[PDB]
Design a binder for this molecule. Structure first.
Ligand SMILES: NC(=O)c1ccc[n+]([C@@H]2O[C@H](COP(=O)([O-])OP(=O)(O)OC[C@H]3O[C@@H](n4cnc5c(N)ncnc54)[C@H](OP(=O)(O)O)[C@@H]3O)[C@@H](O)[C@H]2O)c1
Ligand SMILES: NC(=O)c1ccc[n+]([C@@H]2O[C@H](COP(=O)([O-])OP(=O)(O)OC[C@H]3O[C@@H](n4cnc5c(N)ncnc54)[C@H](OP(=O)(O)O)[C@@H]3O)[C@@H](O)[C@H]2O)c1
Ligand SMILES: NC(=O)c1ccc[n+]([C@@H]2O[C@H](COP(=O)([O-])OP(=O)(O)OC[C@H]3O[C@@H](n4cnc5c(N)ncnc54)[C@H](OP(=O)(O)O)[C@@H]3O)[C@@H](O)[C@H]2O)c1
Ligand SMILES: NC(=O)c1ccc[n+]([C@@H]2O[C@H](COP(=O)([O-])OP(=O)(O)OC[C@H]3O[C@@H](n4cnc5c(N)ncnc54)[C@H](OP(=O)(O)O)[C@@H]3O)[C@@H](O)[C@H]2O)c1
Ligand SMILES: [Cl-]
Ligand SMILES: [Cl-]
Ligand SMILES: [Cl-]
Ligand SMILES: [Cl-]
Lengths: 272, 272, 270, 272
């Protein structure tokens, strides 16, 4: 358990997919890494090779070589393939290398058991990694150090925001930040459909809907205020906003969103 | 109707309130204007003086002096005060000066009638102007030129996005982009409440809820995809997301949001 | 100007609300009983109610008006117009007039009296225990000092704010009518406790005090109600389970509906 | 089992948190205790030291010292920490010291077992302790005396009202007076939103909502009347109040509150 060199470490991705590509691009963009400090290896699809090579990243010929050449190893394969991937690599997974999993639904207890050591960090990012606005949460294995956590905080900070939490919260996280973007995609479409129903052109309705949601969320993220207070700030007496708000409350809007999170969290738990 | 010099016009705010401050800051930040080209005047509250002076802007002693010194005049008082404010200034409202209203709910027909001429642009911004993410729409009076419009686009482009539309769409705009932020504040709170109901800490639930919404909206704004495509991208077969989405659909989530927009737009119309 | 420390107050309509205001003003020292007058109508039990507080009961409404710097109209609303018309010669501009009548607008008050030195107040039922929510509106000739005087008076029986007359239908639906919404809530909470196995007496005692406490927190804490709700909803706990039931059912929207309906009814009546 | 000296006993808090601070302040305010008769010890957060010292209370260096110096010991740590805290202190928990737990959801049977004796009182307060308007209930362990009960009644009388009940009622007490304040916070916000929907300014709507609720509860507390009679007193024929009440009854308002108490009480039982 030697500290990973914060400014010069090399990063390897096992599973050269979309999430790996997003993280790589983000980290290159933010200057946290350069392409020469990133490695991956393809599986069956040769189009993935091109994706990485075109951003300056070297694609090695096996998972084993990626691990050998890396200080930090990110496992970014589909969850149901992760166990075998880790077991095959296990002789190379020495405690001087920080391991990271972004696999949905795979618990730290299992990660540590497969790898045979506890210098492991789990991250649950979300789809908005692609635009640098992921909501990510990390949980630390028994031997991950504070400096390991800072390294991962800086890396994932390059594709959005990143918070820390106990591993036991990750089913609920999955139902909220993991699954939530679909709730808001529905909301955006519905708001646009509402605009069109009220007489607006469809291109404008959609443009407004998307930017309205973006603006409101940016207020919530930057203002330091409770969402109730933000709502209070915009509801003028007897005005349009409160008329719309009343329709939401008549229908139990808040309880519907709560239901969705809860159902999604419960599903996460059922899928293990 | 002399063209307003694009690179040298002076801007005046009538009503030195929150929205004026947001616009002024934005325009100074973007480099559209320098503080020396902006003027305003205080009403009763001397704290507003400080707000403007601290960004380098000169506070004159009356609304009349602001108008005299300005090529472009933005009316940013509360809507129910606007008529008397304009009537009092009318003699100074010569046709060489471009007039702009940001007042919610006040139609172009009335603006033009109060001012006595048609070189008037209406804008409807929203509350996210404070963080530079407003959704704004402008409509042009009968004598507003294409160059006048470009000037106003550039100015409102500095506090978010800005689109153009006929005045007859403004009730529906008001119900969607004007009132919509409250719908999303409710959504954010409810997502957080859902997280807590599924066992998350509050501080984390709320941070995730806000950043989830922000991220999803960023994906909608940048991806070029229809919201249904985005929803398809994240709903993996039999997974957590589609479980949550199904709960939303069982309850008619989309129709509830449509209802809110339609009701808000109908209220806008009823208020005039 | 009405002498702030020495004025005399008259009640026209010696009912419950007049009694509550009289007691509260006596208790706070804003008035003494010797500075308050009223007159009975038909019920002689009202005489004993006022006399037992040290207040003189005069023999007619006319005498009450003559002897008073400030005149509070505290008869039922449908009786107010005739009462004011009968007294109109005595309603001189040196006397401040006040109505606590539900649903009667300032425009009508001023028209019946023939002048504009008139203040309207909408209190509520909790005046009885010194916890009213009250709002005042000022007629066209009511002065700032007149307003202060009324604030002091209604500050003795609860809280008092100022608002334009045009808000009073909505006020009536919220603070006027709202107590009944809470009485339902209290009963329901108790019934819920009994349904979960609690003894009735204890269920009811807990319900009332839980509501009292929560409202005291909202009043004193300086926090938004959402923040207060956040403070008590621990992760996966009992509180968020209960809140989730409320939200599934659209609890908030139901209370909104009640306020809106009540306000609409106020407008329709008035 | 020596009686605790009613006028001179010393009180110790284990767990120097919010509830401990509320109880301390209430007891000082009412004159039941003086600050010199109260002791506590901090854990990790030194801001808690300042909170108690600023009330005149001595902060000792360990839990063990607090116990040694106290006749009455109040356990005010989070419930999931309580078992270990009591086990560690057990050698000092002699029968001459009255023990009290304010921990939510921890039964008398377990308390007695952990401490190794039955001179134990359980109290369930609620959040309004902060303003002296808690609804609290106590249950008595097998060796708690009448004089012990009077001592606790007096103590908790200083932060609200306090009743006695068998331990088997506590899941339902938790769902009603423990959780109930949230139900009322929703109600207060909803009433305010309703005011705004009916045309009121926000500040006034919220002020009125809060005081209306406070008033009505004071009437219920002081009047000696059944809530149905209080409702009958304010519902004039065909008037505004009955119009509002009818909307409540149409929607099954009473059943919804009953549902919330029941669900909360059931959750309490499930959490143990
Ligand atoms: N995508 C998101 O937005 C998001 C959000 C949160 C979490 N995640 C998590 O991120 C992980 C990756 O998702 P993704 O969307 O990027 O998946 P993906 O695009 O399908 O990428 C997975 C890659 O792994 C490769 N692979 C399969 N077997 C392999 C092996 N034995 N060794 C090395 N590579 C192998 C696949 O290549 P072939 O196709 O050639 O077999 C594929 O390129 C998942 O566990 C997911 O739960 C994703
Ligand atoms: N805020 C938003 O998010 C938003 C969004 C869309 C549209 N709008 C619109 O923008 C306008 C301004 O809103 P706002 O929130 O900025 O309001 P605000 O902050 O209250 O600003 C109003 C300002 O006008 C001043 N004022 C009052 N009477 C005046 C007079 N006769 N002459 C000059 N100034 C006077 C007020 O001063 P005193 O307080 O000192 O009297 C105050 O500084 C409104 O029409 C609103 O509909 C706002
Ligand atoms: N009580 C509240 O909580 C509350 C809340 C808000 C507003 N208000 C308003 O306050 C007003 C009074 O209500 P209240 O509940 O006190 O009514 P109340 O108890 O019935 O008393 C009104 C009194 O007026 C008397 N009266 C009838 N005709 C009269 C006349 N011509 N001259 C003088 N007095 C006459 C009645 O006499 P008899 O005894 O002979 O019948 C009665 O004692 C109402 O307008 C109500 O809307 C009350
Ligand atoms: N708050 C309420 O309204 C309310 C209502 C009813 C019941 N209760 C109950 O009252 C109890 C306390 O709640 P609370 O809100 O007051 O919690 P709190 O504010 O978090 O207080 C807990 C305190 O215990 C300390 N602590 C942790 N481990 C300790 C140990 N081993 N020895 C001594 N102290 C330790 C903590 O210190 P650090 O900060 O350093 O960790 C903290 O100061 C809970 O059991 C709760 O169920 C609370
Ligand atoms: Cl509005
Ligand atoms: Cl999914
Ligand atoms: Cl809880
Ligand atoms: Cl009524």
């Amino acid at each position: 358990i030697i500290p990973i060199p914060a400014d010069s470490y090399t990063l390897g991705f096992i599973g050269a997919g979309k999430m790996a590509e997003s993280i790589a691009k983000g980290a290159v963009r933010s200057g946290v890494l350069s392409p020469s400090r990133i490695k991956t290896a393809i599986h069956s699809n040769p189009a993935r090779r091109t994706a990485f090579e075109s951003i300056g990243i070297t694609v090695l010929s096996s998972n084993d070589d990626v691990v050998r050449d890396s200080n930090v190893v990110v496992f970014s394969v589909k969850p149901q393939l992760l166990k075998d991937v880790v077991l095959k690599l296990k002789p190379l997974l020495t405690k001087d290398k920080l391991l990271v999993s972004v696999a949905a639904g795979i618990k730290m207890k299992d990660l540590q058991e497969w790898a045979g050591h506890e210098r492991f960090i789990r991250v649950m990012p979300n789809t908005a990694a692609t635009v640098g606005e992921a909501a990510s949460v990390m949980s630390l294995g028994g031997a991950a150090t504070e400096e390991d956590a800072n390294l991962i905080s800086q890396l994932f900070g390059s594709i959005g925001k990143i918070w820390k939490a106990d591993d036991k919260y990750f089913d609920a996280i999955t139902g909220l930040s993991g699954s939530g973007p679909a709730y808001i995609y529905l909301a955006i479409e519905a708001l646009a459909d509402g605009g069109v129903a009220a007489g607006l052109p469809r291109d404008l309705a959609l443009s407004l809907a998307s930017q309205t949601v973006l603006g409101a969320a940016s207020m919530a993220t930057q203002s330091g205020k409770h969402p109730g207070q933000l709502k209070d700030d915009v509801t003028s007496p007897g005005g349009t906003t409160i008329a719309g708000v009343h329709e939401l409350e008549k229908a139990g809007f808040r309880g519907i969103l709560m239901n969705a999170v809860v159902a999604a969290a419960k599903r996460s738990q059922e899928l293990s």
